[PDB]
Amino acid sequence: SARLSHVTVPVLDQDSAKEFYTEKLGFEVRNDMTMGGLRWLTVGPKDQPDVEMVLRRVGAPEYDEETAEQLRDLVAKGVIGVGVLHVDDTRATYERYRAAGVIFIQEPVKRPYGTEAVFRDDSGNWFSLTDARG
Amino acid sequence: SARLSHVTVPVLDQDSAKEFYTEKLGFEVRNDMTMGGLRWLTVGPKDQPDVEMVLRRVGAPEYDEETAEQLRDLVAKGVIGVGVLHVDDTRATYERYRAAGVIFIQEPVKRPYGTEAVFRDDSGNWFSLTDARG
Ligand SMILES: Cc1cc2nc3c(=O)[nH]c(=O)nc-3n(C[C@H](O)[C@H](O)[C@H](O)CO)c2cc1C
């Protein structure tokens, strides 16, 4: 009975990510704790307890120094898509997030499955934001 | 309100990823279809109907070929950590997973929070496998 509890999000700076996720997206801090130099910083939306996002530092030691530079570069250019956030109304969440300071790379567009928008976090990772259409 | 419904998993080849996730891990196929020339393929744990893992081809349309090549190299080198699977017993799951061809790169190890192992899929992406045992 394996289940997914957390999703790894590579971030450029943990303090900056923590602020973006909690103040801009309204997520809450589920863990913030350090063990052997590793800051275990996890966040999730207010409703969903089963799945957290791990805001994982990209740097020494868990990343080799060359590897780091290459990941950190792919992250800043928006190549890492974390996944899909499902909400009741994409246009409402769009405007809420946008009025806080979230940068959208795609405004809400109607798709066969719902209304979809695309935003990016503070590092440049992207999320699709989705509806079953209002 | 918000929840994370899909997690993106960058795969090298989709047919190969589908076998790994369904045959080795025992995940169920929640979606498999095409439109355009693009394959929407999602899988998930049996007991977790609310989260899908999107097995996304790293390749042309969606990724330019420079970016695509750089991410295929990172993926193949085990740089991309997808997330954390939670089980009742890491050591028993490690065993059951080893029985089908799952390659662990970290064996079960006692940590302040639980016992942790680390495996890789057929592309090279890695998962933490965790429990609450000491
Ligand atoms: C039948 C079909 C269903 C899809 N359903 C969804 C969906 O429910 N949510 C979603 O984010 N994307 C869905 N996608 C595609 C995906 O979001 C899209 O190709 C990328 O986000 C664009 O880069 C679907 C694609 C197909 C062909």
Strands (E), chain A: 3-11, 28-35, 38-44, 52-57, 81-86, 103-111, 114-120, 126-130
The span from the CA of A42 to the CA of B96, in Å, is: 29
Contact (CB, 8 A) for A57 and A14:
yes
Collapsing DSSP states into helix, strand and coil, what is residue B21? Answer: helix
SS (H, E, C) B83-117: EEEECCCHHHHHHHHHHCCCCEEEEEEEECCEEEE
For chain A, the farthest-separated pair of C-alpha atoms sits apart, in whole angstroms, at: 47
Contact (CB, 8 A) for A83 and B54:
yes
Q: Total structural domains in chain B? A: 1
The span from the CA of A50 to the CA of A57, in Å, is: 22
Residues in chain A whose Cβ is within 8 Å of chain B: 1-8, 25-27, 35, 44-48, 50-51, 53-54, 56, 63, 67, 70-71, 74, 77, 79, 81-88, 93, 128, 130
**Bridge pairing between strands B114-120 and B104-111:** antiparallel
Sheet holding B28-35, edge to edge: A103-111, A114-120, A126-130, A81-86, B3-11, B52-57, B38-44, B28-35
The span from the CA of A61 to the CA of B68, in Å, is: 26
Distance from the B85 Cα atom to the nearest Cα atom in chain A, whole angstroms: 5
Please give the C-alpha separations between residue B77 and each of B31, B57, B72, in angstroms, as whole numbers: 28, 16, 9
Query: Cα A6 to the chain's mean position, in Å?
Result: 12
Terminal-residue alpha carbon distance, chain A: 34
Cα three-residue angle A7-A11-A12, rounded to 5 degrees: 170
The span from the CA of A85 to the CA of A44, in Å, is: 11
The span from the CA of B9 to the CA of B94, in Å, is: 21
Within 6 A (CB) of ligand 1 lie A 84, 113, 128, 130; B 33, 35, 38, 40, 62
- Bridge partner residues of A112 (DSSP): none
DSSP B59: S
Instruction: Tell me whether residue B40 is exposed, middle or buried, using C-beta atoms within 10 angstroms of its C-beta: 0 to 12, 13 to 18, 19 or more.
Output: middle
Method: X-ray
The span from the CA of B50 to the CA of A5, in Å, is: 12
Partner-chain residue, chosen from B2, B48, B53, that has the shortest CB–CB distance to A45 = B2
Tell me whether residues B6 and A83 touch, CB distance under 8 A.
yes
Domain that holds residue A42: 1-134
The span from the CA of B77 to the CA of B70, in Å, is: 11
Cα three-residue angle A106-A15-A63, rounded to 5 degrees: 85
Atom of ligand 1 nearest to the CA of B38: 27
Contact (CB, 8 A) for A102 and A25:
yes
Best of B5, B8, B32, B40 to mutate for ligand 1, by most ligand atoms within 8 A of CB?
Answer: B40
Residues in chain B whose Cβ is within 8 Å of chain A: 1-8, 25-26, 44-48, 50-51, 53-54, 56, 63, 67, 70-71, 74, 77, 79, 81-88, 93, 111-113, 128-130
Tell me whether residues A63 and B70 touch, CB distance under 8 A.
no
Which residue carries 């049996």 as its tokens?
Answer: B46
The span from the CA of B98 to the CA of B119, in Å, is: 10
Please choose, from the candidates B4, B105, B120, the residue with its C-alpha nearest in 3D space to the C-alpha of residue B54: B4
DSSP B69: H
**Bridge pairing between strands B28-35 and A81-86:** unpaired
Q: What is the DSSP string of A70-100?
A: HHHHHHHTT--EEEEEE-S-HHHHHHHHHHT
